[PDB]
Amino acid sequence: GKLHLRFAIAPMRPTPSQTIKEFEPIFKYLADQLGATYEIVSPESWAAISVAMTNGHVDVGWLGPWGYVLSNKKAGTEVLATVKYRGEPFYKALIVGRADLPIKKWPEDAKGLKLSLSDQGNTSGWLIPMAYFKSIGIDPASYFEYREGATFGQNESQIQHGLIDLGSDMDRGRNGMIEAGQIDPSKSKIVWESSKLPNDAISVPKDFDPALKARITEILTSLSEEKAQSLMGSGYNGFVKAKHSDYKVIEDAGRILG
Known part of the structure; x- marks a missing residue:
């Protein structure tokens, strides 16, 4: 045994x-x-x-x-x-955007932009950002050029290469990507950050x-x-x-x- x-x-x-x-x-x-x-x-x-x-x-x-x-x-x-x-x-959910994206009136100036959320099992990547948008009466699927199901790796890569405007991530994962040299943080910025979530x-x-x-x-x-x-x-x-x-x-x- x-x-x-x-x-x-x-x-x-x-x-x-x-x-x-x-x-x-x-x-x-x-x-x-x-x-x-x-x-x-x-x-x-x-x-x-x-x-x-x-x-x-x-x-x-x-x-x-x-x-x-x-x-x-x-x-x-x-x-x-x-x-x-x-x-x-604890940790935080993020919506990350291209560095040059205008966001002074976020998200009221973001209609039609390309947003990528993660799979529906993802807390910070899907659940929490959906909850945010619903709290302000935004339906992401109709409001953005919307994609669901991306990994965090794909979101960060696509943002850095200018293929999407916005994507979800988690702070701990973004930190690790920067620390590993996988993200150049000058090419993106935090557009929104959640309150603390249990880890x-x-x-x-x-x-x-x-x-x-x-x-x-x-x-x-x-x-x-x-x-x-x-x-x-x-x-x-x-x-x-x-x-x-x-x-x-x-x-x-x-x-x-x-």
Whole structure:
């Protein structure tokens, strides 16, 4: 009897291969603490990891907030901990624009511009920006030359190459792209930034072994910032214990949008 764990991680970096290269060590560390073998995947979209957890393909998943909320609703998926970025279990959604885009009367001067949002499982990339536009009576699909389903990597690349005017991103991902030399920040600017959102949910299925649940939570939340950072992409530096009600702001946004 060798314990085996199926892991999955959301799109922290622009490609699955970059995500796995940078973030696999925390998963290896976790498995080693348990004496477990493991396997790992990083689906291209935020919805896809939510679906994978819901459909019973994942033992421990690092899901985006809305991905977790959706999976908890559909399948009773449980959040054990929230990831820390720069020491905090929060982040912000962004709408990024071309550097030369006129935005003094944003978004009332933006009708007909090319806007790219992410997949419908993406908290900062889809849910939160849709909630913003709906709060001010804008229907993005009719208001903009609108595209849905892009990755954050695609949005930032398209903005920098002048192929779209506006695209969603998350602050932690944009920071990492700048730091990796993947974005030239002089070619784009932040047009809108959300209020704080709870960070990603380390999640397990409803019927996950209680003893393992407890052990996993303790292993991740006891990590020092230095050790956590040594195992993950730049900026990601630990985990805090979490429960469902920590995701209330996201659940509320999803309700408002139907």
